Design a protein around this ligand. Sequence first.
Ligand SMILES: COc1c(C(=O)CCC2CCN(CC3CCCCC3)CC2)cc(Cl)c2[nH]ccc12
Ligand SMILES: COc1c(C(=O)CCC2CCN(CC3CCCCC3)CC2)cc(Cl)c2[nH]ccc12
Ligand SMILES: *[C@@H]1O[C@H](CO)[C@@H](O)[C@H](O)[C@H]1NC(C)=O
Ligand SMILES: *[C@@H]1O[C@H](CO)[C@@H](O)[C@H](O)[C@H]1NC(C)=O
Ligand SMILES: *[C@@H]1O[C@H](CO)[C@@H](O)[C@H](O)[C@H]1NC(C)=O
Ligand SMILES: *[C@@H]1O[C@H](CO)[C@@H](O)[C@H](O)[C@H]1NC(C)=O
Lengths: 532, 532
Amino acid sequence: SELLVNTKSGKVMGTRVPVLSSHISAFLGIPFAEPPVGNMRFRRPEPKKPWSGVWNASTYPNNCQQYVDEQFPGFSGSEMWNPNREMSEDCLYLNIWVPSPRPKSTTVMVWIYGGGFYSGSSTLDVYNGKYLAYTEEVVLVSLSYRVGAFGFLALHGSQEAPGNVGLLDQRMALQWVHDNIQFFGGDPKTVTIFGESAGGASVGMHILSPGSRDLFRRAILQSGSPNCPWASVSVAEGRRRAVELGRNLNCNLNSDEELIHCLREKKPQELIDVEWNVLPFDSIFRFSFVPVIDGEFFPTSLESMLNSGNFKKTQILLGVNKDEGSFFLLYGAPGFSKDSESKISREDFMSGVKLSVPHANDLGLDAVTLQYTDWMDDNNGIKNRDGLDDIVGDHNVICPLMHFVNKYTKFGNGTYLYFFNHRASNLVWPEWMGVIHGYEIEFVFGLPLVKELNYTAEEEALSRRIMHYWATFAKTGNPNEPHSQESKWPLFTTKEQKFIDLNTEPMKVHQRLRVQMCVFWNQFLPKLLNAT
Amino acid sequence: SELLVNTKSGKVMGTRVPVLSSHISAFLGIPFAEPPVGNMRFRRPEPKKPWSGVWNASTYPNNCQQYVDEQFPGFSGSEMWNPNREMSEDCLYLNIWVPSPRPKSTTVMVWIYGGGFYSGSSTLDVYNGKYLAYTEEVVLVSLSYRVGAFGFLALHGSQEAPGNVGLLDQRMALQWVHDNIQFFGGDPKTVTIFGESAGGASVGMHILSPGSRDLFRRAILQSGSPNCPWASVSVAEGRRRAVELGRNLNCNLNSDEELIHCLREKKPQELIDVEWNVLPFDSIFRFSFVPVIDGEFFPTSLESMLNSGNFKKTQILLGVNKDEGSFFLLYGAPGFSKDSESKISREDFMSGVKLSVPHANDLGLDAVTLQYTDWMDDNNGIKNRDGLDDIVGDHNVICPLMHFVNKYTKFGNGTYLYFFNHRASNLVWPEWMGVIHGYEIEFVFGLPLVKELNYTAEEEALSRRIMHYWATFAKTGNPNEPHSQESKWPLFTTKEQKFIDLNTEPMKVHQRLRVQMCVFWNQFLPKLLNAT
Ligand SMILES: COc1c(C(=O)CCC2CCN(CC3CCCCC3)CC2)cc(Cl)c2[nH]ccc12
Ligand SMILES: COc1c(C(=O)CCC2CCN(CC3CCCCC3)CC2)cc(Cl)c2[nH]ccc12
Ligand SMILES: *[C@@H]1O[C@H](CO)[C@@H](O)[C@H](O)[C@H]1NC(C)=O
Ligand SMILES: *[C@@H]1O[C@H](CO)[C@@H](O)[C@H](O)[C@H]1NC(C)=O
Ligand SMILES: *[C@@H]1O[C@H](CO)[C@@H](O)[C@H](O)[C@H]1NC(C)=O
Ligand SMILES: *[C@@H]1O[C@H](CO)[C@@H](O)[C@H](O)[C@H]1NC(C)=O
């Protein structure tokens, strides 16, 4: 049968779903690991043991246990990121969309969701793989992984809670794809991994990690990279946060076993309830339980690996949006509101930068402030707002990614760089927020192709050219097809450093993306913080 | 007799000189001090003891002993600054231009020359007082003072070479004006001191020093100010350089008396020959023998005085030229030439900043570099040239002065600020040097009124409006003729921070002269260097 597939662990039965006046095949909620429940909380994932009978792969799986956003209840702009089904620790599932009829040896694309390593789900509406899988005739997979403490509680030296298990989940799903995607008409030799924000960083992390390199061919990174400040911690810091988590729940802290055993008796939301409390600073764009530089998943520091060329060498396609920072100011910085234009006072601006660069000393703070203040106009609330937006975005996303793109291109086999700066005509967030962190995503997934979503002709065309770039890249390592000149996306090189704008307008080529700000963030500021 | 004048120290005979189809009285080379010779080199100046008979004050006196610049022999652009008279240690004289007929009790303006405290002459063609005295009917006085080692060798504790004696020369000349200016028709209660560069700095130094305040009514500062980084040194540094000067001359260094004795037997030119060797670093815009923060001419640190309001409260009129830096790059930095466009390579631009901020640590150097480099275009030889020009001008003149004008204004009784940015139509220096340090002087002194000098009609008009400002300010404390037609130069207030452009175009008001850069020099950079 087309819907019935015998995999290396059992038979699964999928469903025929419609898409754009046609249909494709969907297999939802296939398990790829043993339920990381009970005594297996915090432990490495174990491969899903073979089942007898047919697995109902007809409906989305549970979502992983995560903090749930309630700032704006009812509000679609924030609620679209929240879990859209039951939360459970039994959440290690993946989903597959196969074009109908089933192709032979076609290109595979594995989605990896963001959410700052504390949240995120594969079952979200924006990650509906049907449009992209159908329009671009690729086998589309979306995996899942443990988030928050469940995924990234790190007590180095313990084999009970080593850290990074959330990335290991992703690896096991990648390993599952390598073993079974051929049964779905997928070529396991042509797998492109891709993800946004935290998902972006994850993609990069699998590039660096040796135990991950052979489980995929190429990589797309959207608005995230492995070296992001919010995206990892030392073993010392992971331990400290872990120990501090026990403290918030009256746990025994004399040993890891006692500490771990304690945290395992607690219910999931008990952990989540106190999760934010282990952060060292009052901060924004910082998350408690994130990957650790352990010496195992990552043999040595990210920078050194980047320097020595110790990573997977292939093609990467990567980029950022114009206003990466606004979402996080709204949730964590004074003066910002979803309902005003959020002109920021000088006072809230100063307040802002302190939250944004939580680890800086006073000289570092003055440096950042100077770097973003127009002194002919320091009490301009609009410039102060856009300034703070750029500080958050440049520091957490754009500049970390550029450092990565420059480092990778020395050893890579082809880099493509984009700047996404279209603002959706139907955005429900206020104008001041601009081109928001996460909002290129709906374009990648072909959401503008559906008429009821009320996008414009030009946005549908944009999404269509975007999906094509994505998939074409995925099959060939080049987002370009050999005709027109309308237009060719240039290769990013060490010398000329080209990239392209992604919007409704005809393609423009620029050079040196946010280089002025990024020299500050990548070279001056770090040298300054080390020095002082 | 108009030309014969009985002063407190003896009779004096001047001479009738022609000016612009008319005539005025000059009194050239009037002594105000005992010749600081022999046992009195380095020593405080002593008043000129009374003479018999009639002094022939009809010719220009000697110029003080100084480094003569031989870079462009024959070239008028450099040679206009060199000694136009014989050099000697017997140089403590002043010059007076008196309207004809002699005014009853008219405004007095005393000129103090620049030259980095190492050079300078009262007798220069460009400091010729006849036009200004004549046109605005003021009594114009030209003082002099010992420069370099002779004027500013400082060995704290010693009474033989205490430091600051050249500032004391100035004071003594001011004292002479106080005692004798009435005999020329001048009001000793209405004396404006003015000077450019070192003169400008000196003018503010008298503003600060308690023992100089009662010797003048108000102050004009052009392209210099007391807080300039080149304009003073500490006791420690001052001694170290003095001791080093003796080391370069095989002097006994075992005590101040044996060092001073050794340096006193040397011919002046021997001193000057090694003068530059005692500088701490390879630098531009640095000079070896300058005023000392000594606890006597300056009771406390210059910055503490400005803070406490410890200084003369009167009116000041002050400003800068658009390209303070070019003159010094030409004599000091790689890539700069009188005869090319001096487009600067990135490597030379690097060398430039190290030469220009010779006290910065590496972090400091990185900050300056970042602050002035456009990283989309870093190999632009013009942008690198202009940028290094701005670095020099902003660091050494513009930003010091803005610091001064802001601090002063909190206690002052009226501030006027100008940005001089006209390039003379007949400049002999290359186009790339722009509006040069010291080239507003010829406009202040009325040289464009003389037809054979070949200034344009618009430049003569500019000199006239500029002289009227300086004079009107000197008479009333305000450059504007109140309730007259012409547009009015606004007060600089700590809130609005207004100033004007000075050029051939109608007047423009602006606010916050070079804030962005001066915030960096005055606030950020010193914080960076103070850290460890
Ligand atoms: C949960 O809210 C916070 C934060 C935040 O960082 C909120 C900003 C995120 C909220 C949701 N959204 C998620 C992404 C997921 C991947 C694709 C793009 C959208 C945007 C970012 C910070 C602190 Cl300190 C908080 N404290 C309490 C709640 C809370
Ligand atoms: C003598 O030059 C130097 C320097 C300098 O930085 C000074 C260059 C000056 C040349 C004369 N010029 C005229 C001024 C006079 C005052 C009014 C305005 C115009 C100003 C610039 C530095 C070093 Cl290390 C030197 N070594 C040898 C000569 C020399
Ligand atoms: C799979 O589960 C769905 C959801 O409950 C159900 O409607 C469907 O009938 C099931 N399929 C089979 C073959 O049992
Ligand atoms: C990719 O690898 C091939 C084979 O080694 C090489 O010829 C090609 O130049 C590489 N491309 C890039 C952009 O590095
Ligand atoms: C003053 O000096 C000038 C020039 O040297 C000379 O012509 C004049 O005669 C002198 N005056 C007297 C009274 O000797
Ligand atoms: C100057 O001082 C006088 C006398 O105290 C005062 O009336 C006047 O307002 C002052 N002017 C300024 C500009 O400070």
